Design a protein around this nucleic acid. Sequence first.
DNA 1: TCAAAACGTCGTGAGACAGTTTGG
DNA 2: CCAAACTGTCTCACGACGTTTTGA
Lengths: 152, 152
Amino acid sequence: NTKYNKEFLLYLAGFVDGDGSIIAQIKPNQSYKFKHQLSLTFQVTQKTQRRWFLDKLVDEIGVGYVRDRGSVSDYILSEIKPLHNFLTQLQPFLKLKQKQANLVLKIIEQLPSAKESPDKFLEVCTWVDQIAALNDSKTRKTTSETVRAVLD
Amino acid sequence: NTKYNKEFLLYLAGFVDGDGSIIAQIKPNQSYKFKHQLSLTFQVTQKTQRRWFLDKLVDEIGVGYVRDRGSVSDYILSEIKPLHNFLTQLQPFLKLKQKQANLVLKIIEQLPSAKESPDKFLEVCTWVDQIAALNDSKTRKTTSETVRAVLD
DNA sequence: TCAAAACGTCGTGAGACAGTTTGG
DNA sequence: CCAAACTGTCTCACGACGTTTTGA
Ligand SMILES: [Ca+2]
Ligand SMILES: [Ca+2]
């Protein structure tokens, strides 16, 4: 359970507030009990020419990976528990995305208990609706209401 | 000469590397002796619904202003003296824009003598070139070479 | 003759999703 | 069934300039 140097977390929070994204999604998938997956992602996007900077992030955060999508690349951290640790430490230094971080950080602490009740799952899904409304969301399709319809 | 809190600078350096810009321009303007103005800008852009964040920067930096351009707003700092003080302190924490910051600092220092020798003015425009080269420059028109064709 | 502000827009470089597959 | 990875794309929200005017 890695501890990060404060000055790193201060800079990083500023960069995240700039080019970063804290993301929650409900993914339709028949193989799941409620026919949806709950997906959490922390990401930083950057021009591939500066991919080196994302690579440095992998090294410094000690987990996650970088992916290519042409002219641009992304640092991706989706593993639920390294994510909890990282976001716990980053959260108090964020300013634009501190609300997203804390929703995520609590959606995490209720996953063990949101696959039991279909109603609990609907509750958690509404929190991801919240994260999406805090972000500059423009192409969102699957929400906690395409879900509620399905749970019927 | 205000001395800025280091935690603030660390966060700001991350945010600058993210959504900020360090700009130097050679502006054709016939009322100047060498037919161009040397202009320097530090800026941070953010969509207007987030203007409060830019307003805070005005207060915390103690100088500069926010302008609106529709859906988006920019914190703007162009005054040469505050810019020098400010960049001197920010620069050590920058990771993507450090080179640009140092070149702006160099330009500022040479500006006085730059207005006296055409050759020295050219040197400076050369440094303007390096800055544009370091940024994601895509609409640039006036270059240190446009200046030579006029120093003639 | 200047520093600085004002006014304006091109071309992405991000952000924030989607859908689908892997593998335990 | 589930976490996580893999693969793709919509629509800006930025970045990084330009030209013109103000007021000393
Ligand atoms: Ca941003
Ligand atoms: Ca950026």
